[PDB]
């Protein structure tokens, strides 16, 4: 139930087109993981009976992107004590590996 709720809430945070039963949304995603996203989209739409191409196309990124630092079971804690002071500038040098 929680998952369904999250899904619908996510879809609310979108712009539903008026003239077609199709949805456009902008998303942030890792660049390196874009292929993984497209494969996931392929599987998702394949489950859907309409098999819409569902093509995600990059836009001239020009708003401030979020700062994504990949962490694991070990490094997550160190990243958090850094984040506690503030979130680094996009493409800032991450101090955590030295912390």
């Amino acid at each position: 139930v929680r998952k369904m709720k999250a899904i619908y809430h996510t879809l609310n945070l979108c712009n539903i087109d008026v003239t077609q039963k199709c949805l456009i949304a902008e998303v942030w995603c890792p660049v390196t993981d874009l292929d993984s996203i497209q494969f996931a989209l392929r599987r998702g739409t394949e489950h859907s009976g309409s098999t819409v191409p569902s093509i995600l196309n990059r836009m001239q990124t020009n708003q401030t992107p979020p700062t994504y630092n990949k962490t694991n079971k070990f490094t997550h804690g160190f990243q958090n004590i850094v984040d506690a002071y503030g979130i680094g500038t996009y493409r800032e040098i991450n101090p955590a590996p030295y912390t």
């Binding site: 003239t19 077609q20 456009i24 902008e26």
Partner: protein, 57 residues
Amino acid sequence: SQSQGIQQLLQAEKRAAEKVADARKRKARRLKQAKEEAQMEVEQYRREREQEFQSKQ
């Protein structure tokens, strides 16, 4: 390319709307034609039954 995708989808939606409204206009026209033809067929029936009456008479 999304702004172009947007423009393409808007053009497709424009055409779709035009095609459906046109179908509705056609529906109205066909309905009127249906009534006109029906009345002509009714007259044909009237003529034939009048001829049958004359034969019987």
